[PDB]
């Protein structure tokens, strides 16, 4: 426990030092004068302030944090700014839900929650009251976010942080300029469109104010109206004189020429309600709610219910249906009717629907159902399926034939009916051919929309939009599809979409899966409602009654990063003075144009030219955004709008469009989903408290660098804490015994091996950092680096060479620094370095001798085999080393070499190999030993490349063993080791010993 506390002490000290030194505050005015090696602008999408940042946020931002930590060592000047997103309604929603209990009860509220979660967050009793207003949320959470992030140690120029609502005047002016420019270029449009809608919230329910189905949109349905004929059913007797329609949803209108009846569920609760023209529709309550928000009722959302009833009360009723050949069709019962899809009212097309003929034959079989539900023989018997569409592999009555084939006799055979439904599922969309007059011999795909229009024009059908999948909102309201008027961004325009597609071609997506996501969400995308009325944020500058949603004021704010340090300077709300002395409202549309558009004219403004020139310098220098890292959830919405709006704001400058986007997975904790409800949860401040800034950052580097779910494992973080502590102890020990280390020329075999391994580690780790495989960089640059140092220490019999030890410490500290900058800064100062490690440069790697490394691996294997053989049957040991392969081994290896040379390095099958080696008469006495030899060669070939096909080792085997005979004798606890050239060996050993695999007898 004391080790984590030691790490925390080091981190706090070093953080204060960094803060005072103002190391991570970059200014384009100064950095544009010294052309170093280019700028590096990274962004992490600013997180919502409806709470405290948790370990997933930290994992996602660690990507660009490690990126800048690496790129600064390579000479780039970096900009890693960090804003905070307060736009949206959850803050206001939970603040008003709080004021609800504050007013309707007391402090604390008497029950029979929002007050409960606030007290869970550990707040005092008399301080949750202040959270009734949203302004207090905005004053409370963003400071704690900044505090936690600084306590982590991010390389952020905090002078550029900001807030996103209209509480910030500067960011509000920025959003105003953006949306004025968008409306000036016909990007915003007012219109009445279909959209997923929250009745409780009274505004469209986009993706970030949702709770189920984060990408679901509306789905269209043809709503048939079947006129109820007199004599009306009993329960509708009070509705005589009015027109009553059973409304049924379908997706195949072209089939309505073959209606035999209408199915209702006898046990479902149906509602007959008055529509806008005074007619009466019989559907269900959810269907009627959707219709009420799609203009079907006189008032929006108001459903005037005039008759509740059950399906059994509707049974037997006579109907008039469109297109069908039967003048009167009846309402019949169907047991298997979902209450989630449509209106609860289905039509009977028994020729091309298996369920329909199933239920019809069930009613036709026995008297049981017809009597249990009151269906006389007039309502079932004279009704036969009508040939309407022919599928070539089935016939006119496709469903009839495939249900006679699958031998179905009940409407409850879920398995057989599902199979039959899938068997003709899409063979009717295309291969179906119409048969009715006016369409005889027409491709069904070429006529279905015309038939739907025919019914709509005749007033016999309407358009019913329904959520394709159930969508719950933050306010726990079930969403509908509303045809409502709003301001929308026209992401559907072909020119805009093609230009953003070209922008996606140039964009760097670190894998093809992310690009596929982008292309799919680019094709599918269309009109996007951006206007809200309830929530926080910035109002449309011309329609002050509409607020801009969170996913629409967040598309180009990266440009505001470049100027925020001079506009508002650190003050999150922008309420303090301006360092350049620019008034908040002094920023006009033309002023912003001049700041961000290169060929924009300097407009009439009381601002001096130097201030605007400095802002324009900052923007032109830092842009474009080199990298934006995010969880993959933001690809289908925020990042696509990001590309769109960048194309829209700078349509002439592709050099200002985003460069790279990197998506990662969502963070698991201990291999489980990170949810407070399961107790498997860690906030950033808690994670720091538990593992220090450096141990959690280490375990986060190891969490995952693919798009698959990342995994933060706490045990690995504890092990890394232990290893970091012992590493600091070892560096201290080495600095203490500076003079106890061997000096002079670094010449020994071990010195050379270790120097080569160190340079190889540098090269591997640099490559891993370029690829942003941070887990792989941690593997090669820490665990394997430490393995090389531990081996060098274990084998250095004459003590480790001082200069090599301190080169290793320096380089290891440089390689670990982007992951654990506090520990590495502490060790940097412990080495007596003048400057901070944040001024160091990437370590130069010397030469890498592959032969040295291969000989060290050979020595490892030899020692391992010696210790394994020591397990059984001393004091003296004799090792025999083969200079060449014995005759039979040499012959078989030559054959393998021939076959490898023959076909670009593919060894044939062991079948053919054993055939050829049996054809060679010299191998008679050895055919049993031959194929295990081939197997060993193939294994080590796949393991360590083709170098094992060499007829002689690249290094002196005996000399390698001799450079460490002393270590071998000391480790094996023996008194002497005799290394001999295997020609002195007896018959058995001389014949079996081959190079690289020395034999030995104790
Ligand atoms: C620009 C604007 C439209 C963005 C909007 N304000 C917003 O999304 N705010 S946020 O707090 O929900 O996320 C911000 C970043 O953090 C990632 N992330 C979030 N949770 C996890 C998790 N459990 N595991 C891994 N990564 C996560 C997430 O993808 C995103 O890149």
Residue numbers in the entry: 7 to 118, 156 to 916, 933 to 1061
The authors write:
Leucyl-tRNA synthetase (LRS), a class I AaRS, is particularly large and complex. Structurally, LRS contains an aminoacylation domain, a tRNA binding domain, and an editing domain, known as connective peptide 1 (CP1). HcLRS functions as the intracellular leucine sensor to modulate the activity of the mTOR complex 1 (mTORC1) by directly binding with RagD GTPase, the mediator of the AAs-dependent mTORC1 pathway. After screening truncations with different lengths, we found that deletion of the last 106 residues (N1071-1176C), designated as hcLRS_d106, gives improved crystals that diffract up to 2.5 Å resolution.
The asymmetric unit contains two non-crystallographically related hcLRS molecules with differences in B-factors and subtle differences in orientation of some of the peripheral domains. Luckily, in the current structure, the VC domain is visible even though there is no tRNA bound due to crystal contacts. LeuAMS, a stable analog of LeuAMP, was bound in the aminoacylation active site in our structure. Leucine, instead binds to a deep and narrow pocket formed by residues Tyr52, Tyr54, Leu594 and Ser597. Interestingly, residue His251 from the CP core is within 4 Å of the leucine, and the N atom from the imidazole ring of His251 is only 2.6 Å from the—OH group of Tyr54 suggesting a role of His251 in leucine binding. In our structure, a post-transfer editing analog Nva2AA (2′-(L-norvalyl) amino-2′-deoxyadenosine) is clearly bound at the editing active pocket. The residues involved in interaction with Nva2AA are mainly from the conserved ‘threonine-rich region’ (T-rich region) and the ‘GTG loop’ with one exception, Lys464, which is from a helix of I4ae insertion. Experimentally, the role of the tRNA-A76 3′-OH group in the mechanism of LRS deacylation was tested in E. coli LRS by replaced the terminal adenosine of tRNALeu with 3′-deoxyadenosine, the results showed that the 3′-OH group of A76 has a prominent role in deacylation reaction. Interestingly, a very well ordered water molecule which hydrogen-bonds to the 3′-OH group of tRNA-A76 is observed in our structure (W1 in Figure 3B and C).
